[PDB]
Amino acid sequence: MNVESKWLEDFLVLAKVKNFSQAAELRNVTQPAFSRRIRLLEDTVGAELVDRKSKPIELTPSGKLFRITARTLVNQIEAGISQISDLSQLGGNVVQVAAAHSLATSLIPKMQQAFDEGDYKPILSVEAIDVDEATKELREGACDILLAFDDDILRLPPYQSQLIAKTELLPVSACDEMGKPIYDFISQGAVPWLTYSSTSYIGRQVEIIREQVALTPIFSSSMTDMLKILVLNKQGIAWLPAYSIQEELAQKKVAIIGEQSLRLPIEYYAYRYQARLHPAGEKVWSILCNLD
Amino acid sequence: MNVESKWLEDFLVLAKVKNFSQAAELRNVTQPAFSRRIRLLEDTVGAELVDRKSKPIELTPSGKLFRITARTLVNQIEAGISQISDLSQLGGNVVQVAAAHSLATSLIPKMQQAFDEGDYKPILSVEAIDVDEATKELREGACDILLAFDDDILRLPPYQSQLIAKTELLPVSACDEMGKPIYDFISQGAVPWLTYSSTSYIGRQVEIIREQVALTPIFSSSMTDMLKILVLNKQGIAWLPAYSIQEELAQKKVAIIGEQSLRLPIEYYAYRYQARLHPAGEKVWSILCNLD
Amino acid sequence: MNVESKWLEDFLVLAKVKNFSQAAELRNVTQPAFSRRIRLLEDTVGAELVDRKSKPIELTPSGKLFRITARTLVNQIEAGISQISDLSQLGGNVVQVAAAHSLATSLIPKMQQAFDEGDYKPILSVEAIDVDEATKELREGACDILLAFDDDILRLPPYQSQLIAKTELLPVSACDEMGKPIYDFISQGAVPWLTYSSTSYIGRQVEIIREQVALTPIFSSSMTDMLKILVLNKQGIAWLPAYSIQEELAQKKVAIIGEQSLRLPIEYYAYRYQARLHPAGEKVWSILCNLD
Amino acid sequence: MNVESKWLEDFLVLAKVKNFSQAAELRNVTQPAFSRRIRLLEDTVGAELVDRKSKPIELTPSGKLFRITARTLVNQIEAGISQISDLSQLGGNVVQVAAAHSLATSLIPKMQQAFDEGDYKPILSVEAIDVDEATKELREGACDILLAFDDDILRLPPYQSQLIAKTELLPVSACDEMGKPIYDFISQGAVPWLTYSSTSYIGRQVEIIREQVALTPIFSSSMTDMLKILVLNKQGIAWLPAYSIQEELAQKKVAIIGEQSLRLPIEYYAYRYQARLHPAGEKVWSILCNLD
Question: Where would I find the HTH lysR-type domain in this sequence (chains A, B, C, D) (predicted)?
Answer without folding.
Answer: 3-60
